[PDB]
Amino acid sequence: IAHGDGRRPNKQRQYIVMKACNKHHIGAEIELAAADIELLFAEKETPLD
Amino acid sequence: ALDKSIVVNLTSRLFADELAALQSKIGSVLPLGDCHRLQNIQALGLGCVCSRETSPDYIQIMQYLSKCTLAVLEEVRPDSLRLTRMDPSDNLQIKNVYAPFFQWDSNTQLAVLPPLFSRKDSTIVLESNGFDIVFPMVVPQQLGHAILQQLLVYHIYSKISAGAPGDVNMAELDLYTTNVSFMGRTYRLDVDNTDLRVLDDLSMYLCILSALVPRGCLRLLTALVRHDRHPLTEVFEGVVPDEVTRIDLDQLSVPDDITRMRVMFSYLQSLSSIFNLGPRLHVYAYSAETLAASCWYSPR
Amino acid sequence: QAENAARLGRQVLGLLPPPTHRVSLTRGPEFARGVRDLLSKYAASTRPTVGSLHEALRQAPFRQPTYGDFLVYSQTFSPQEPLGTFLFSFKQEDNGSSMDMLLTPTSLFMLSGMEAAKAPQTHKVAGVWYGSGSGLADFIPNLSELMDTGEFHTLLTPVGPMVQSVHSTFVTKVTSAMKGVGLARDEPRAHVGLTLPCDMLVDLDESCPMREPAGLNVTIYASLVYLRVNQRPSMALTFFQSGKGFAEVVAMIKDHFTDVIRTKYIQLRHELYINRLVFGAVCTLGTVPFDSHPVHQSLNSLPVLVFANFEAACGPWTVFL
């Protein structure tokens, strides 16, 4: 404000504002037992399997 | 229309440790023995006169001060220093980076005094080029014409104790000299109980004056009778001490007194100019959070 | 509405400091055609005209002093002014952030406490500006003891003339001027000269033909004499005006303050106090042009001098004796 009084008038002003980001994390979990994965590779030897 | 800049070159680069000591300031007051813009390093300090192996002095600095030209930093590139020339009656900007710290104010008088304290406060050794730059001691004039005041007292009583022990008490001398009072504030300074030597040469003079001076005034009194004898000089018998006026001319003949009087005033004029002709300025605007002292150079 | 701002592009871009004259070499020998004010002797003719010497006045020397922006109470500094006074800057301790105390010379008479007929003119006038000489003495309780040891002449930094004063209820803004010729405010292009009361000035120039040469310079000084009246300490102020060099005036001031030296130093037969021995100081207040006539004025009556074309230049308080 340019006001005509005895209050000490001030020049131009300028601010510098400076951010920063964050990091976040997710961790899941899976049920796999090797008795399942064992029979993933053998096949055909009976119509049961 | 005119342009001014002073660019000092170096032979080599600098260490990265020294640049932090020369970004401690970015605007300060350098003396400079040249007026031209391309220049080797050997003049911008006070190492043109004041060095370690030399006997450090006050007067041979002070004679060199008023002859010298000031210049103000703007930038420290890793190779070359950039300066701004200090014209007569020119306005420019200072940052008050000096040691030991004193607080400034707008509308103070400023005398450029030579440093006389410990080395680490004033100088910065440039380890690259082997040359010492010395910064002058920017003190305001009311302080600068009183910071010398009690220190010069302190050097005189030190010479008394080292020849005669039972005459000066150290607790009296320490308490009254190194605690300079100003503004309502105090400033305790560095006493130098490390072993002084900057300020023998005034005390070399001022005592050898102070015996010659009262002996010199008796001959000046009884050698003036006219009716042009100035009317105030009748009064000043009441000022001169009574023991001073009890001296004959018996001990000193006529050829001895010439070696007094032709030499008497030769001290005083060598002495009066080194209390007065500091290259002096004034400061009209100041802010402690920015530390922006504000010169205008009065050549003097 | 940019037609308003198109005027701002005129005045700002025209009123700049002159740039550093610098030319790259691939243009060639053209640099000297940008050298104008280094000339002096222009082109006369038979009947010259504004159209023949508009170039001769287009060049102009570069002159501007710098100002001192102050914040004053409405008590030390009077609401009325003649706008061209003289100032000081009292200096004790930085209490406020921007809280400054100023002294006009008409005020500083009342701060002293001297006789009436030693300065008979302003004493009637300086009694209606301020109180009984005690509204200001409440601000410094050392005005007896600043007089004793001789520290008051150390605590005055003169400033010079005035330029502007916007006045409010308690706080007064004072735009002062050092270094030269302050541009005026209420009258544009005018130049606020320095004004002195006719009582406080004492000339040194004036003589009967009886001869001394002219020059460019004549220098207003500023005396300050510690006297003692009624066995109470009180200062004394006068002015000077003489284009005569520093070696002469110190030998001439002592003839003017002869009796003041003669009164006080009779008293030191029975006593001596080393703080009392200091007597006076002389500052340099700047330069005045030669043979510029000080035009007398009058204010409610108070005869007030003026100096056109005064330029300011301060100095140290060199003690004399």
Coordinates of N, CA, C and O in Angstrom, one line a residue, chain C residues 7 31 35 90 131 144 153 156 192 208 236 241 249 281 319:
Chain C
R7 N 3.0 7.4 -19.6 CA 3.8 8.5 -19.0 C 4.9 8.0 -18.1 O 5.9 8.6 -18.0
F31 N 32.9 4.8 -31.4 CA 32.8 5.1 -29.9 C 32.8 6.6 -29.6 O 32.1 7.0 -28.7
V35 N 30.3 10.5 -27.5 CA 31.0 11.3 -26.5 C 30.4 12.7 -26.7 O 30.8 13.4 -27.7
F90 N 20.8 13.7 17.5 CA 21.3 13.4 18.9 C 21.5 11.9 19.0 O 20.8 11.1 18.3
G131 N 8.1 24.6 25.3 CA 7.6 25.0 26.6 C 8.6 25.9 27.4 O 9.1 26.8 26.8
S144 N 23.0 18.1 32.4 CA 23.9 18.7 33.3 C 25.3 18.0 33.2 O 26.3 18.7 33.1
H153 N 29.6 17.7 22.2 CA 30.0 17.9 20.9 C 30.4 16.7 20.1 O 30.5 16.7 18.9
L156 N 26.9 14.8 18.1 CA 26.1 15.5 17.2 C 26.6 15.2 15.8 O 27.7 15.6 15.5
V192 N 15.4 23.3 -2.2 CA 15.2 23.8 -0.9 C 16.6 24.3 -0.4 O 17.5 23.5 -0.2
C208 N 35.5 47.0 5.4 CA 35.6 48.2 4.6 C 36.8 48.1 3.7 O 37.7 47.3 3.9
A236 N 26.7 27.1 24.3 CA 26.5 28.3 23.5 C 26.8 28.0 22.1 O 27.8 27.3 21.8
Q241 N 30.5 32.3 8.5 CA 30.4 32.2 7.0 C 31.6 33.0 6.5 O 31.7 34.2 6.6
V249 N 40.4 30.8 10.0 CA 39.2 31.0 10.8 C 39.4 30.6 12.2 O 38.8 31.3 13.1
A281 N 34.3 23.2 19.6 CA 34.5 22.4 18.4 C 34.0 23.2 17.2 O 33.1 24.0 17.3
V319 N 38.1 19.7 17.7 CA 38.2 20.6 18.9 C 39.1 21.7 18.6 O 40.1 21.6 17.8

